[PDB]
Design a protein around this ligand. Structure first.
Ligand code: HEM
Ligand code: HEM
Ligand code: HEM
Ligand code: HEM
Lengths: 137, 146, 146, 139
């Protein structure tokens, strides 16, 4: 991750930070609807539209991303506990991290399209790939 | 693949509002900028040396319009996608040797460009239908590898 | 896909020397060990808690033999692989939802297992033919997704 | 992220690889070029016939870079930093190709050292090759 990349990710996340539950909930709803097999990891959830578990969980996902943004120089260190959960406990297939990242970028483009320039898009993709790599370790 | 009447409606309805030239130019530009190894296939286009040069490159803009236009040929005949893209499959597979993973990447980028262009009208159900469309076109484009 | 005279001879010739039970167990165990997220599909098999436990697990070894046996049904008639695997495609796609990238990973592991079993008899040309076979089987297995 | 056991497994099997850099590298490339013919498009300047001198010289350099990454397994990005610029910026190697080369390398190791390439060693070597691939594609 370059320094321009870090500033680019910090940049859009000032637009994201205010809306963690809203954007996190929409990111998950798009994933479950666009890629239905992803629902098999949440058999304990109510997955109907607007359910409280999705909103609760969506807020935590984006809050973890914000923490990775606020500590972008050592993201592996900020998200250490989540790796054991996703790789060891949940055995999330690594392909699913690309699907969620795609849904997150769709949410960003919908709400802040002028801010999601090609260069910002490039940097956010690198950020999301790095997070996915850490959660699959 | 089987198309529900609602999926047909979501696809044809959004297509009529797509700015083919602008959206196509932007999707190809983002491929070259976000996934820079793809620039290797496009040296005939000249200056791809910066994001500015790519987005202002006339051949990139013209090519992107052609790419999105072909996506429209799938919209027009959703049950015939395999045959519509058979000649393009020979080109990309036999002649250009584009790895099919890159077809997926272009599709994902196009979805993000459509979300930017349509904002909240790009519902989760719309995205699911269009993701299905780009997945089916990419499958048809890879046919000649098998 | 077309099969050359040499490719058919390389595939059928090697197949007659494969220890289906031993190679099959080894390939399935390596999948679970090298790519541990795949263990999520096999909780019914019991103790997968370490490489030792996995290699010695009877259901893993039994299942590996069945998996390699079906590969042999591809070897037997290489021009009918699509139909041969159509019911297994329903199982893996419609029922199990295994992502097809995992079919590629099992195929690559099998090539390494075959290399280990045959040493220098596994020539570059033989590797090329067997990689083609595992790619064609994986394609046939994913058919019900498209 | 390479664990402590991972690094032990990688250095262990790399003790049998050292001293055969030219032979194993040449064989890894020949396997890639015949198994995956499109990979030849990165080498238009090469004589790519079997046993050619360019392949043997290039194969030796590839395995030598792996051995140097193994000897500095705690900082692979720093050891291979100028190679990243060559592959990602100058050559524009599609990232799918590093998996093809890594596959061919494991095939060579299995052919020559099958007893050393246990499932655990295979797992660790796969992580190492994927880390090298990540570095060489990181532009
Ligand atoms: C950017 C990528 C991701 C981030 C930042 C992330 C973050 C999180 C967080 C913060 C938690 C809750 C931890 C806790 O409360 O102890 C969690 C749990 C979970 N994650 Fe993820 N996650 C990501 C990707 C994924 C993916 C791709 C899947 C599967 C498709 C997934 C499935 C789950 C499940 C099932 C849980 C447990 C939910 C519960 O029981 O409350 N996650 N993740
Ligand atoms: C589903 C995805 C894609 C579709 C529908 C598509 C469509 C097209 C179309 C319609 C052409 C027309 C050629 C012409 O009008 O002269 C073309 C050519 C071409 N495509 Fe694609 N394409 C896709 C993905 C890709 C990707 C991912 C790459 C490379 C990474 C690629 C590389 C090329 C190249 C190099 C040409 C030739 C351009 C020229 O010489 O003028 N395509 N494609
Ligand atoms: C790539 C080529 C593959 C082939 C040719 C193949 C073949 C087979 C065969 C013959 C069966 C026997 C079904 C039965 O006896 O009931 C089976 C079952 C199964 N396969 Fe595959 N398989 C492949 C890949 C995979 C992969 C990559 C996964 C998971 C990551 C997987 C997961 C399963 C599971 C979970 C079962 C059910 C086992 C049980 O419940 O007894 N398979 N497959
Ligand atoms: C483990 C992965 C790889 C390693 C360790 C590696 C290592 C090297 C080394 C040491 C060089 C020579 C650099 C120099 O002389 O300054 C080189 C050059 C090169 N590599 Fe790689 N490489 C890897 C993957 C790949 C792949 C996957 C491709 C293409 C499919 C590729 C294509 C090339 C080419 C075309 C050159 C230029 C060779 C020349 O002109 O002599 N490399 N690589």
């Amino acid at each position: 991750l370059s320094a321009a990349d870090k500033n680019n990710v910090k940049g859009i996340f000032t637009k994201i930070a205010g809306h963690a539950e809203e954007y996190g909930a929409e990111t998950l709803e798009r994933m479950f609807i666009t890629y239905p097999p992803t629902k098999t990891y949440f058999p304990h959830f109510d997955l109907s539209h607007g359910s409280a578990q999705i909103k609760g969980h969506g807020k935590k996902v984006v809050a973890a991303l914000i923490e990775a943004a606020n500590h972008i120089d050592d993201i592996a260190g900020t998200l250490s506990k989540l790796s054991d959960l996703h790789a060891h406990k949940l055995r999330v297939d690594p392909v699913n991290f690309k699907l969620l990242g795609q849904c997150f970028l769709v949410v960003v483009a919908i709400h802040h399209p002028a801010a999601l320039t090609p260069e910002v898009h490039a940097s956010l993709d690198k950020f999301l790939c790095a997070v996915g790599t850490v959660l699959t370790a | 693949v089987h198309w529900s009447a609602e999926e047909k409606q979501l696809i044809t309805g959004l297509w009529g509002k797509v700015n083919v030239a602008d959206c196509g130019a932007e999707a190809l530009a983002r491929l070259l900028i976000v996934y820079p190894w793809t620039q290797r296939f496009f040296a005939s286009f000249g200056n791809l040396s910066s994001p500015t040069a790519i987005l202002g490159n006339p051949m990139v803009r013209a090519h992107g319009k052609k790419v999105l236009t072909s996506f429209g040929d799938a919209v027009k005949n959703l049950d015939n996608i395999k045959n519509t893209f058979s000649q393009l499959s020979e080109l990309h597979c036999d002649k250009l040797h584009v790895d099919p993973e890159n077809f997926r990447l272009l599709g994902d980028i196009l979805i993000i460009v459509l979300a930017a262009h349509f904002s909240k009208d790009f519902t989760p159900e719309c995205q699911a239908a269009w993701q299905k469309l780009v997945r089916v076109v990419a499958h048809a484009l890879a046919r000649k590898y098998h």
